[PDB]
Structure 1
Amino acid sequence: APIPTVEEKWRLLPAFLKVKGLVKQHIDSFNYF
């Protein structure tokens, strides 16, 4: 039987990109220091 699909999975990515992700490493490290 075909397992049910969660079509919207990919929407977890934009939220992650909002709170963390690209070019946030330098900002977070400098803030912490």
Structure 2
Amino acid sequence: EPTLTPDELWLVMESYWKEKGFVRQHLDSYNAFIDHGLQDV
């Protein structure tokens, strides 16, 4: 079978950034600090 193309693999990676954003590391980790961070200190 004509395996995919190098152009359908674009549509997989296009769904990666419209689902989760680009500022992930700051935003997501701080989100966990509110839940389980303050209570343990």
TM-score bucket (shorter structure): 0.5 to 0.7
CA distance in 2: counterparts of 1:32 and 1:14, whole angstroms: 27
User: What are the ranges of 5 or more consecutive residues in structure 1 without an aligned counterpart?
Assistant: none
Identical aligned pairs, as a percentage? Answer: 45
| Superposed displacement of residue 31, structure 1 | 0.5
Match of 1:12 in 2: 12
Runs of 4+ in 1 over 4 A off after TM superposition: none
Match of 2:38 in 1: none
CA RMSD of aligned residues (A): 1.9
Q: Please, what TM-score do these two structures have when normalized by structure 1?
A: 0.54
Match of 2:27 in 1: 27
User: What are the ranges of 5 or more consecutive residues in structure 2 without an aligned counterpart?
Assistant: 34-41
Q: Which has the larger radius of gyration?
A: 2
CA distance in 1: counterparts of 2:14 and 2:2, whole angstroms: 23
